[PDB]
From Swiss-Prot:
GO terms for cellular component: fungal-type vacuole membrane; Golgi membrane; proton-transporting V-type ATPase complex; vacuolar proton-transporting V-type ATPase complex; vacuolar proton-transporting V-type ATPase, V1 domain. Subunit of the V1 complex of vacuolar(H+)-ATPase (V-ATPase), a multisubunit enzyme composed of a peripheral complex (V1) that hydrolyzes ATP and a membrane integral complex (V0) that translocates protons. V-ATPase is responsible for acidifying and maintaining the pH of intracellular compartments. This subunit is essential for activity, but not assembly, of the enzyme complex. This subunit is also required for silencing the ATPase activity of V-ATPase when V1 is detached from V0. It is found in: Vacuole membrane. V-ATPase is a heteromultimeric enzyme composed of a peripheral catalytic V1 complex (components A to H) attached to an integral membrane V0 proton pore complex (components: a, c, c', c'', d, e, f and VOA1). Interacts with YND1. This is V-type proton ATPase subunit H. The gene is VMA13. Its main location: membrane. The keyword Translocase does not apply. Keywords: Hydrogen ion transport, Ion transport, Membrane, Transport, Vacuole. Disruption phenotype: Increases the ATPase activity of membrane-detached V-ATPase V1. Abolishes growth at pH 7.5 and in the presence of calcium chloride, abrogates growth at pH 5.0. It is a peripheral membrane protein. It comes from Saccharomyces cerevisiae (strain ATCC 204508 / S288c) (Baker's yeast).
Length: 447
């Protein structure tokens, strides 16, 4: 036909049912002078036609009313009838045309749309979108608008009401289908994105298995642009890496796929310096193991295995090209210094030193910053906070003894000192590391 979105949605269909339940007595309303027959009569008529008329001079009054009205329960049944048309197998075909020809009508409806009772807002949305993504009704400004509209966004944010939240998302996602829209949307990822993920932890541990998907999908869609992909990954990282978690724990295979895919999309030849990404997956999210395990399994859905198989390869290769230093960075970058062979490996040090003495030892300074942070930042001795330190005093030390000329930067940055007081500690290892870190410098402070 001409696009009847959300046709299988049972929870929508269900929401729909709770709205058409509340009946309106036009006539009376008319008669009571609460409406204008014209309208009132026109709807009362439609209402039957639908629930028991080409479409042309039917809307106009509706909208009118819609616009001109204070009967929240009225506009509802209307907003709805509007919807009922849109999907009506019979109508809903011309319904579009109506706007196809008067794309402002759509502008107008739009104003009367998205308001009041949570449902009113939905169907309204529902309707409005049904059109926005229409044959040739594309109208980002509107999208742009609804994207910033509250009422609906709010609906979308509250995860507690799955049915709705659910819908919204599906709406949003239907728009994302519209390449053009894609930019607008992403532009406000800040509103749906978070939600999407909250929706994913919850999952990570049919309706709730649709939401998951739909949200993926929405993602997967936009993600399609190297940059967008670029962005997500290095902004919604933590969660990113999580996909896997669900990727794992999950079934049906309609989700995984999405995950797996998103993931790849994000390592696509196209995402700039996917490399990091691969690194990250491998490095920061244990992609590998995780994938290896999936790689071999029950995937009635071929392509699924495929994709999985494919991911497998990527990871694997990049892996080989893995130097211990990377690991180094990973911890440094991620701000999580550990205790790992390389750390205490003069050899690791003996080869990756230069790397610290880079662009003005960026890396070192980096190293240093971090340490500096932990000190004030939070100012906690909780194992963690308390570890990074030594680890830092440690790496720092090494660098120190190796590149004696590194002392300056130390001097400049402040750590040089920072350390010194670090000796006045609570935890041995810390003052200690710091100590071992200071007796080192001591040697290079003179002649």
């Amino acid at each position: 036909g001409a696009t009847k979105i959300l046709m299988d949605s049972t929870h929508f269909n269900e929401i729909r049912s709770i709205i058409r339940s509340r009946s309106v007595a036009w006539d009376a309303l008319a008669r009571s002078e609460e409406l204008s027959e014209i309208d009132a009569s026109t709807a009362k008529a439609l209402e039957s036609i639908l629930v028991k008329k080409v479409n042309g001079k039917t809307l106009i009054p509706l909208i009118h009313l819609l616009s001109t009205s204070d009967n929240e329960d009225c506009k509802k049944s209307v907003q709805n009838l509007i919807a009922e048309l849109l999907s009506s197998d019979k109508y809903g075909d011309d319904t579009v045309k109506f706007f196809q020809e008067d794309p402002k009508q759509l502008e107008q409806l739009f104003d009367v749309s998205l308001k009041g009772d949570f449902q009113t807002v939905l169907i309204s949305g529902f309707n409005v979108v049904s059109l926005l993504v229409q044959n040739g009704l594309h109208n980002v400004k509107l999208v742009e608008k609804l994207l910033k509209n509250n009422n609906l966004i709010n609906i979308l944010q509250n995860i507690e009401q799955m049915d709705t939240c659910y819908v919204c998302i599906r709406l949003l996602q239907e728009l994302a289908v519209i390449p053009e829209y894609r930019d607008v949307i992403w532009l406000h990822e800040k509103k749906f994105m978070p939600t999407l993920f909250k929706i994913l932890q919850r999952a990570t541990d049919h309706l709730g298995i649709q939401l998951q998907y739909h949200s993926l999908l929405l993602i997967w869609l936009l993600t399609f642009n190297p940059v967008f992909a670029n962005e997500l990954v290095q902004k919604y990282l933590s969660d990113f890496l999580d996909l896997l978690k669900l990727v794992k724990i999950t079934i049906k295979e309609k989700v995984s796929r999405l995950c797996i895919s998103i993931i790849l999309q994000c390592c696509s030849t196209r995402v700039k310096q996917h490399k990091k990404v691969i690194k990250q997956l491998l490095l920061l999210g244990n992609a590998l193991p995780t994938v290896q395990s999936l790689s071999e399994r029950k995937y009635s859905d071929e392509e699924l295995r495929q994709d999985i198989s494919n991911l497998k390869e990527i990871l694997e290769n990049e892996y080989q090209e893995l130097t211990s230093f990377d690991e180094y960075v990973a911890e440094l970058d991620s701000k999580l210094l550990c205790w790992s062979p390389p750390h205490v490996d003069n050899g690791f040090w003996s080869d990756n030193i230069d790397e610290f003495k880079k662009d003005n030892y960026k890396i070192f300074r980096q190293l240093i910053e971090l340490l500096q942070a932990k000190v004030r930042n939070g100012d906690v001795n909780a194992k963690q906070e308390k570890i990074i330190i030594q680890v830092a005093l440690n790496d720092i030390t090494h660098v120190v003894e190796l590149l004696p000329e590194s002392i300056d930067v130390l001097d400049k940055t402040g750590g040089k000192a920072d350390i010194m007081e670090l000796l006045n500690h609570s935890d041995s290892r810390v003052k200690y590391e710091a100590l071992k870190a200071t007796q080192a410098i001591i040697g290079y402070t003179f002649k």
